[PDB]
């Protein structure tokens, strides 16, 4: 029981950390385009990441 609980917890924290850091990478790649007045994100980068 203890081993299963520990393994599940470790898998969950690994998945969460990976997802959060990938989200951070997205948000840091697409952060300057929201600050530039006018202009627009390229369609390719706006497809490989969801760009509002």
């Amino acid at each position: 029981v203890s081993a299963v609980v520990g393994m599940s917890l470790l898998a969950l924290i690994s998945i969460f950390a990976s997802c959060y850091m990938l989200v951070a990478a997205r948000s840091k790649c697409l952060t300057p385009y929201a600050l530039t007045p006018g202009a627009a994100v390229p369609w390719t980068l706006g497809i490989l990441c969801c760009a509002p």
């Binding site: 952060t31 300057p32 385009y33 929201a34 600050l35 530039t36 007045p37 006018g38 202009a39 627009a40």
Partner: protein, 162 residues
């Protein structure tokens, strides 16, 4: 003269002010279809409608941006991206630009005056003042540009954050 009067005429409607403890401590501007607000200054914008609006933050570039609603759409600042060399207007005198650097005469920039945009000869806005560093009778400027699609910060050594 007339140019000073027209500069004041725009400034009475385009540039806003932030306040804290009953004292104004920063100026926010509306450029293009966004808002610029240097991120070192904290306070409540002296406008009910803009304050309720949700912001965005990036401490790398020391600015806060957003999207304007549709009832100040006409009150734009006519952005531009070209940087020929010459002289450029500002609320605190005429600033000249040469060698990729902005220069001001000594102590014409005051503490707490950050956020005021610069104007070119055609009146378009080219950068936002963030801070300054002095050398001799001239003081260098730390401003953020709008080169193409990516904003870029340029800062001299020992810059004092206004």
């Amino acid at each position: 003269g007339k140019r000073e009067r027209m500069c004041m005429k725009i400034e009475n409607d385009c540039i806003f002010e932030v306040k804290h403890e009953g004292k104004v401590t920063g100026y926010a501007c509306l450029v293009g279809d966004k808002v610029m607000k240097p991120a070192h200054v904290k306070g409540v914008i002296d406008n009910a409608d803009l304050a309720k609006l949700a912001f965005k933050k990036s401490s790398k570039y020391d600015l806060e941006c957003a999207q304007i609603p549709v009832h100040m759409r006409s009150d734009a600042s006519k952005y531009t991206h070209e940087k020929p060399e010459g002289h450029y207007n500002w609320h605190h005198g005429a600033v000249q630009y040469s060698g990729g650097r902005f220069t001001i005469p000594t102590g014409a920039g005051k503490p707490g005056d950050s956020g005021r945009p610069i104007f070119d000869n055609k009146g378009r806005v080219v950068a936002i003042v963030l801070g300054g560093a002095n050398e001799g009778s001239r003081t260098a400027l730390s401003v953020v540009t709008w080169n193409k699609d990516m904003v870029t910060r340029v800062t001299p050594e020992g810059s004092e954050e206004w």
